[PDB]
Design a protein around this ligand. Structure first.
Ligand code: CER
Ligand code: CER
Ligand code: MN
Ligand code: MN
Ligand code: MN
Ligand code: MN
Ligand code: XE
Ligand code: XE
Ligand code: XE
Ligand code: XE
Lengths: 334, 334
């Protein structure tokens, strides 16, 4: 009768498989600047905003015209192998990427068709900026927990190639301001990549990592969004951390890893300081891969696994602040 | 221990409120043709494809530059009034429209900000072509059923104005084929409008309509998709109807209303004939409103309510065939 935080946690949802794809083509910030230099000089800016402001030394791009669905498909094939199961076991496939093939059909239906899902497989896309992979995990988790399905795929492929092309062109244009130039530099922190996760009812995969679920808080009053964005973002994260304490029983020091979506080096710096987090428990790929949007979290989790910096029983925080503003925080126990 | 179809149905999820918005501006197919006539003649086509092929006499457009989020917001305000509850009760807001304000943030976060949702309110978009409102209902239903929330908004605003403008321009172009002209005529069956639904835990709204849930089947092998589309669509719907029999206990004759997404008059005709459905139990707005995409189903349900052609105990089938291909069928008991 009496509600407790732990009541809303999932008891029988696990991570059966997990994979990521690193996009092959390394584009250094060194090169981008060589191309921007006549516009840096021309604008009188001695600031390497990319290398030691945003703190990005390189990002990965695709080598060819890879569609979001292609990248998600490749990651999904890898995750199925990791889980050691055939596509026929999948009852749900959710796509969570920002990158999108078409207006319709859903990117999820395209990935599903590529993989050869059965006619029982439910598919749809979830869109929520940088937090959507966590949303997709949670949505799949509720179907698993309820027993509507036994296995689910959550996939996310991101391509920034066209953005980089369109963006590099507008910033080397003659009639471009220092405002625009700055307003567009942000696109140049984005990276390509993909990730997929197979989730399953725990009894089908004894001893697999457990997904407990998590909490979300929002500040949609700020959906219009600068230092203001960092300040409101941190304030939202503070209140989300209170919710996490109330549901997950989180204390910053009892967590073993923080898998955090990253916007820039100084953003992550401000967050880590605000919460008193030990920076050693925060793996970062932003410096060499840039911001891979909603794929960032599972890619980092996947890299931790393969490295392999994870041990059974480890408490792993998954979190991010997304446009909205929204903030989500969820726990995996390895 | 032993699974039964009825087990996966929701027992404590109801529809607390429901509203629709009719877009104000009537554009008759008469007018569109007056503008297309020099291209009909020029192409030697005596075929009024719109009026007595697709069977659309008129569709509604917006009078001004209405964004999806604006239309969804207006419908949501109306649904809250219908449910007699303040926005502060809402723990989840899902947007399901095809029309989309920006790449980010989600359209849902924009609507939420407009309405003034509390910081506890979770938001995200679901994208799945014409079936997404049903997906959003189901996603909200699982959170309600589980007790994670007490009230949810599912909203959907559609705007076709720009499509109609871009489309009318390409079909009155000199160098346009009869193929292209036909390949684009389809955009001219789309209409504008909006709908929103407040869902709630049944005990909070005794005697409100009950949402039971439903089933989905897919044929993602056909995600590339003509008479072929109709044939595969009907075949998919046949198998989805078997699933509905197995879960919902559906027999065509025991249903009181069929709320069906509509692509065109001959499409709906073929469907109704294939299933032996009494056409009198199928309200249609396509002739005067066109195809409002994923908003079509809740708009028709909302019009049935206000008319009011619904009585307590009525078994109401919600269904559609969407790009993917996917097909979903769910039941509401009024
Ligand atoms: C630590 C403070 C964070 C400020 C918030 C920035 C928004 C981040 C982005 O714009 C993208 O990286 C992802 C997103 N918005 O969902
Ligand atoms: C009855 C047979 C239906 C054929 C399927 C057509 C696809 C319909 C559409 O293209 C849109 O109206 C909605 C959608 N695809 O989700
Ligand atoms: Mn290369
Ligand atoms: Mn373990
Ligand atoms: Mn008008
Ligand atoms: Mn009743
Ligand atoms: Xe895993
Ligand atoms: Xe945290
Ligand atoms: Xe209702
Ligand atoms: Xe049906």
């Amino acid at each position: 009768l009496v509600p407790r935080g732990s009541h809303m946690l999932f008891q029988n949802v696990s991570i059966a498989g997990l994979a990521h794809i690193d996009a092959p083509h390394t584009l250094t910030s060194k090169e981008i600047n060589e191309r921007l230099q006549p516009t840096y000089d021309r604008l009188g800016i001695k600031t390497d905003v990319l290398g030691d402001v945003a703190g990005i030394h390189a990002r990965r791009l695709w080598d060819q015209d890879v569609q979001a669905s292609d990248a998600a498909t490749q990651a999904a094939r890898k995750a199925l192998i990791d889980a050691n199961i055939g596509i026929e076991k999948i009852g749900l496939l959710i796509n969570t990427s920002v990158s999108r093939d078409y207006l319709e059909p859903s990117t999820a239906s395209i990935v599903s068709g590529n993989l050869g899902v059965s006619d029982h497989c439910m598919t749809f896309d979830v869109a929520n900026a940088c937090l959507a992979f966590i949303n997709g995990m949670d949505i799949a988790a509720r179907m698993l927990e309820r027993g509507e399905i036994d296995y689910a795929l959550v996939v996310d492929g991101e391509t920034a190639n066209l953005v980089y092309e369109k963006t590099l062109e507008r910033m080397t244009s003659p009639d471009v301001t220092e405002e625009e130039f700055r307003n567009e530099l942000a696109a140049l922190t984005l990276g390509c990549g993909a990730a997929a996760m197979v989730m399953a009812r725990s009894e089908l995969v004894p001893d697999a990592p457990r997904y407990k679920g998590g909490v979300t808080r929002s500040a949609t009053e700020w959906n219009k969004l600068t230092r203001l964005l960092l300040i409101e973002g941190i304030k939202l994260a503070q209140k989300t951390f209170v919710a996490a304490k109330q549901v997950l029983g989180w204390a910053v020091e009892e967590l073993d890893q923080f898998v955090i979506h990253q916007v820039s080096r100084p953003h992550t710096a401000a967050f880590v300081k605000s919460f008193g987090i030990d920076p050693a428990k925060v793996m970062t790929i932003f410096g060499e891969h840039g911001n891979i949007g909603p794929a960032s979290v599972p890619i980092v989790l996947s890299k931790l696994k393969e490295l392999g910096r994870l041990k059974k029983g480890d408490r792993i925080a998954l979190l991010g602040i997304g446009s909205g503003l929204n903030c989500s925080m969820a726990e995996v126990v390895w």
